[PDB]
Amino acid sequence: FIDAISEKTLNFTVALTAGRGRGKSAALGISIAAAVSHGYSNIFVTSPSPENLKTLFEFIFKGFDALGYQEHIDYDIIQSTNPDFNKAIVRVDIKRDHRQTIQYIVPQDHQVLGQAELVVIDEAAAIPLPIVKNLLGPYLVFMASTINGYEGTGRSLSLKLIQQLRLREISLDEPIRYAPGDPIEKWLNKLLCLDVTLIKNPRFATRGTPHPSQCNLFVVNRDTLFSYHPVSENFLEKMMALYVSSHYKNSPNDLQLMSDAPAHKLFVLLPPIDPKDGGRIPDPLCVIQIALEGEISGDLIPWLISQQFQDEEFASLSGARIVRIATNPEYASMGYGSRAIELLRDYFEGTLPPLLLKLSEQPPHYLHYLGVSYGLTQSLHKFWKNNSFVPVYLRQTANDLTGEHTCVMLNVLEGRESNWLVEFAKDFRKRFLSLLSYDFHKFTAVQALSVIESSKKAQDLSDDEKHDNKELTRTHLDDIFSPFDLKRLDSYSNNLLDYHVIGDMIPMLALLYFGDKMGDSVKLSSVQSAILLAIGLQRKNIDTIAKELNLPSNQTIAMFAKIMRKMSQYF
């Protein structure tokens, strides 16, 4: 921190990743006191929630090696007292920058944090990668993170943060609450699988692997996984670290919740099984954990379906909810998850007990449909686009901790067809069009177009017998737009109309372009349509659309006029 104070590096990026027993209140207070002595104005405190920044402020000026931390009876908690940091007319930085000058800020703000000079951010790995990039910009920011702990992420998220960078970084491993090398804590970490070694494994690290054609999507018994064999311990710890590295959050009781779930099973994708040895433990390629749903045996898919519509048939159907499905953390380019999704679809479509359970030696239940509930990530939408899981239910209120909305997807992975999934997708297509900029103002336009393509593919999917939409009648077109607006559109065809005059008629035009009446006439489905959807459905400005489409000239205005003149020819 003193070296960063002495250096003239404008991008003073300080990264601090620590394990258990870090003393983060003492560490941030020491950094705040160093920034008090050799800083310009103050330090902007950034945390995802009301964390121990007050304990960090209590450890900055006061707060010696005997911390004496308290919940609500501490000196920092009480406001009606004199904490001896009372400032006056002097050049003192400890008295001025104090508990009266706590520069706390939420990490969701980016413009005010970009205007700041010195800031400190804690648990930045919990924030999104674009959010972390907007937070840790070209200013002097010190980043604090906790690795392999409760309510935290893994080393792969830290490695993804390191891949987002490349700076000035350091690591801490020794505990401060207890001492490092405690065997009871080592036994507790062994019992709770707190140690993460998926990156430390020599065969399940990245996309360098065998072919996904020779994929062994075998099964494993839950009691065999619960057995404390030495081979079973190494595979389950590799399986748990694979689940830890993929998901951002990591509940400490999630492993016990997965083990005790009788209605949830798991399948392990493996590489090509070498018959030359056959007995050595192979690292699995991917792990897929799913659960059933219905009225047999945890019903988030049925609760969302009941909230979406009144479908007692879909409520009582045999649905499958994928709890977790992931390959190795750097094996995203391997594509083995696509074969695993193909294997999971094929599985729906056809001392102790034995350890290695065969894929063929398992009778599956008569499942009606499958699916999962994932966040609105572009890569997650890309994995669902490679899959058949069409999204239907989207959470309007996004998760505060995750920072992203929740999307529930379903796929009819059975010979039996119901056509209620196709009917609900058309309702979901109409709902997602209406929810554009009603609550979903801040969303990616390309991802919204990809979601619209996901709804269109479900419309073009199976059980397509009598769900074909019709065009617009002459009376239907008369109710849609007035004759004066039609004459206004002819002036737009004469290109004398501005973006303001065209933008007034853009609202009913956007619903028509989402409707099948305009689609039957023409198809302007290039990147101009995404600009058309962002202007109308997402209600963005012309400058906002131009920055999103990376074509900031008047060609965005020209593309909208070309789309408008195509609609004028559609009359």
């Binding site: 054609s213 020779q214 380019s333 594509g335 290039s526 990147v527 101009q528 990376n550």
Partner: protein, 362 residues
């Protein structure tokens, strides 16, 4: 201007073609006298794009991915040519010794350029003019450069692949070829897998740091009228898929998962397969374009169906594509340049901010 599709409702637009003439062909010699002699509303409607003409245009065209520049090698005399999309004309013209049958550029904006001709001289050409000329032990048919490990390498019809490891100023590492087929060379941009176009449809793969080959492949046509040379190879940017294209017009899209077959398509004429270009950088992924001598065909690599096709009036032997665009270049054997824009393939770039507007509605 033009509305010529392949009867698939994909509105391909072609600019500066041989159908349209030079709207400013001779301002003093012709246009001053023919202003009154020809009102020429069609010629006033002819819109010249990026304002040069290139006669017997090239056997090699190139566009730098940064700086927005283009590279061209003329053959009326051996030429080297710089064009600037920010300034829309001839940035620079210089003669050279022989006709550049192959060429590669440094990674940024025309600063350094490596040329290969009919003779065995490699031309390192900097910001100045003709900085150095070298010698190659065999002749020249193909060359390519890796910024990783600092090594160009050159090969033409023999046994030793000449790795021009430009660090320390020598060339080393004679890689042992098989049966004198190296007619194309290719780069895996992320990992450095080598590729050689063998006359008996083999391709090599080498580890550059280990200086050793790892495997060989074989490409077997089910019809197999004649034994064939694979004529070009290419690696996608994701580091997964591999492309092959032979003299019999058979394009192979090899997904690397130890597969004898591929996505196999044949051209309608089967003269050759010249170059294979991906379109991963633009949206609507899994679209790929292969070019014959007289047809360039963009098609879906997974559906196996033809997206569109561009038919020129004269034969071509190079295809260049600026990334982020729906825009393409050719090196035709004629006085104009066939360059064509497909708005459904991608949007127009920044210098063509009005070329997207003028032909969409006309």
């Amino acid at each position: 201007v033009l509305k010529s599709t392949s009867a698939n409702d994909v509105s391909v637009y072609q600019v500066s073609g041989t159908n349209v003439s030079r709207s400013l062909p001779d301002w003093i010699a012709k246009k001053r006298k023919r202003q009154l002699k020809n009102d020429l509303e069609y010629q006033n409607r002819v819109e010249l794009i990026q304002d040069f003409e290139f006669s017997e245009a090239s056997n090699k065209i190139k566009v730098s991915r940064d700086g927005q520049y283009c590279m061209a090698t003329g053959t009326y005399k051996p030429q080297i040519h710089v064009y600037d999309f920010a300034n829309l004309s001839l940035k620079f013209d210089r003669h050279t010794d022989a006709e550049n049958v192959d060429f590669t550029i440094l990674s940024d904006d025309w600063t350094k350029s490596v040329h290969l001709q009919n003779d065995r001289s490699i031309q390192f050409q900097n910001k100045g003019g003709l900085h150095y000329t070298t010698r190659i032990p065999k002749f020249g048919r193909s060359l390519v450069y890796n910024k990783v490990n600092c090594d160009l390498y050159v090969g033409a019809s023999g046994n030793e692949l000449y790795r021009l490891n430009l660090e320390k100023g020598r060339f080393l590492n004679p890689f042992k070829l098989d049966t004198e087929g190296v007619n194309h060379v290719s780069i895996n941009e992320v990992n450095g897998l080598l590729a050689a176009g063998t006359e008996t449809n083999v391709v090599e793969f080498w580890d550059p740091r280990s200086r050793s080959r790892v495997s060989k492949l074989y490409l077997e046509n089910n019809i197999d009228n004649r034994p064939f040379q694979v004529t070009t190879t290419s690696f996608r940017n994701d580091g997964l898929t591999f492309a092959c294209g032979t003299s019999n017009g058979y394009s192979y899209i090899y997904d690397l998962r130890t597969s004898e077959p591929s996505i196999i398509k044949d051209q309608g004429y089967g003269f050759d397969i010249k170059k294979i270009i991906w379109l991963d950088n633009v949206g609507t992924e899994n679209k790929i374009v292969t070019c014959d001598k007289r047809i360039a065909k963009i098609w879906d690599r997974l559906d196996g169906k033809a997206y569109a096709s561009m038919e020129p009036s004269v034969d071509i032997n190079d295809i260049e594509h600026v990334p982020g665009t729906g825009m393409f270049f050719t090196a035709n054997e004629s006085i104009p340049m066939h360059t064509y824009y497909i708005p459904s393939l991608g949007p127009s770039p920044r210098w063509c901010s009005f070329l997207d507007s003028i032909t969409e509605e006309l």
